[PDB]
């Protein structure tokens, strides 16, 4: 009545969600998940997330599905910047840092991490791209540190008027407003690729 592959490994979700350090949004981390089993309902309740939004699929119905590969993206942004991590959204983050496709099928998980990513003197280790000539294609990662040319005069790699470094630091202090505090974000992408499915839910096979 039910038949899934004989997969025994557990998916390294704890390696992603409970990592001691996350990445800057402009250089986001992508973990490729394959050949493992994952329960998405225990993940929904494993912690108290601020946003757990799914698109297309549902977390409850997600346990009944198999996928070729599942992709996990993790980074840190501001509190009121999480709304840009969604299909069809625009903004400094969606345009120049991390972009979702309009036909996005998956879930985006975010939770406050002020106690982890805020330092007293200010945590300037989390960066974000402020200047970019054009938008990002979906799932594109631009880690270039080229001096941004805002004027007609070339920059020759030196900062000045109309020549600005394209990356800026978040001022992450624990006394910030709720919208200014760091939020760790995890994006889950489900890929069906006409191939053996290797990432399934926790359903047990019969005969």
């Amino acid at each position, epitope marked *: 009545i039910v038949r899934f592959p004989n997969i025994t490994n557990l998916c390294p979700f704890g390696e992603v969600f409970n990592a001691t350090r996350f990445a800057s949004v402009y250089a986001w981390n992508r973990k490729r998940i394959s050949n493992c089993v994952a329960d998405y309902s225990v993940l929904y309740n494993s912690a108290s997330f601020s946003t757990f939004k799914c698109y297309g699929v549902s977390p409850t119905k997600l346990n009944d599905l198999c996928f070729t590969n599942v992709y996990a993206d993790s980074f840190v942004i501001r509190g009121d910047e999480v709304r840009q991590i969604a299909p069809g959204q625009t*903004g400094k983050i969606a*345009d120049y840092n991390y972009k979702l496709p309009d036909d996005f099928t998956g879930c985006v998980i975010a939770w406050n991490s002020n106690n982890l990513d805020s330092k007293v003197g200010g945590n300037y280790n989390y960066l974000y791209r*402020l*200047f970019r*000539k*054009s938008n990002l294609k979906p799932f594109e990662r631009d880690i270039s540190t080229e001096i941004y040319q805002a*004027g*007609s005069t070339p920059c020759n790699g030196v900062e000045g008027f109309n020549c600005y470094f394209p990356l800026q630091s978040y*001022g992450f202090q624990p006394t910030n407003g709720v919208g200014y505090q760091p939020y760790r974000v995890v994006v889950l992408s489900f890929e069906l690729l006409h191939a053996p499915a290797t990432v399934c839910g926790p359903k047990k096979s019969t005969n």
Partner: antibody
């Protein structure tokens, strides 16, 4: 030079349309955050609209649906198409570039005056 | 949205004194997203300070800014005759960006 020169402002009645122009030199409009800021007579400053280098556009809630911001890279000019104008839209409109945390709004035009009355 | 309440309404001082302008926000604002602008009658706004403390290029040393959270300050250590104008603060960290109603710096006699 680094100048922003504005034009297109004038007199119109409620409902009419107007297109403001903002010609730039020393700064490329398609490579910067370009904003419109207005100031009603004897009042403070109010942000109106912005267009990103990548094309994203945002408007204030009071002018959303009636205003449209655009640019022409060949002419290096910025536009603000205003339709269905109202008496409260009477203000001096400024164009400016935004450097955000990297330097704020450092270049401003001289301003063009718009008057809406019947 | 975020409301910036500047105080006092008008500041009456003689050239040479120190001017202290207050900008109080209705919400906590990160110091990196506060700016100060100067406007004279009939002219366009002139950027003084961005990031609550960074001077724009061409702004003399007598202009200085400070503040964090909800309370911000623009200080002119020694007022010059050309410093009498209207000064606005501005937050640009929360959409939509907003300005204060302005403080008028007026020659006292």
């Amino acid at each position: 030079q680094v100048q922003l020169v504005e034009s297109g402002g004038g007199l119109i009645q409620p409902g009419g349309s107007l297109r403001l122009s903002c010609a730039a030199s020393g700064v490329i409009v398609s490579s910067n955050y370009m904003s419109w800021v207005r100031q009603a007579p004897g009042k403070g400053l109010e942000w109106v609209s912005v267009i990103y280098s990548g094309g994203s556009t945002y408007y204030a809630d009071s002018v959303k649906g009636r205003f449209t911001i655009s640019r022409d890279n060949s002419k290096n000019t910025l536009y603000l198409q205003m339709n269905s104008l109202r008496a409260e839209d009477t203000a001096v409109y400024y164009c400016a570039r935004d450097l955000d945390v990297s330097g704020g709004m450092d270049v401003w035009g001289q301003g063009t005056t718009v008057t809406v009355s019947s | 949205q975020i409301v910036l309440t500047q105080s006092p309404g008008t500041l009456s001082l003689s050239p040479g004194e120190r001017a202290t302008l207050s900008c109080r926000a209705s919400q906590s604002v990160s110091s990196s997203y506060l700016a100060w602008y100067q406007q004279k009658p009939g002219q366009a706004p002139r950027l003084l300070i961005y990031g609550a403390s960074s001077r724009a290029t061409g702004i003399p040393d007598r202009f200085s800014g400070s503040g964090s959270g909800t309370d911000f300050t623009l200080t002119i250590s020694r007022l010059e005759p050309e410093d009498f104008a209207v000064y606005y603060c501005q937050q640009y960290g929360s959409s939509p960006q907003t300005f204060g109603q302005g403080t008028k710096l007026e020659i006292k006699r």
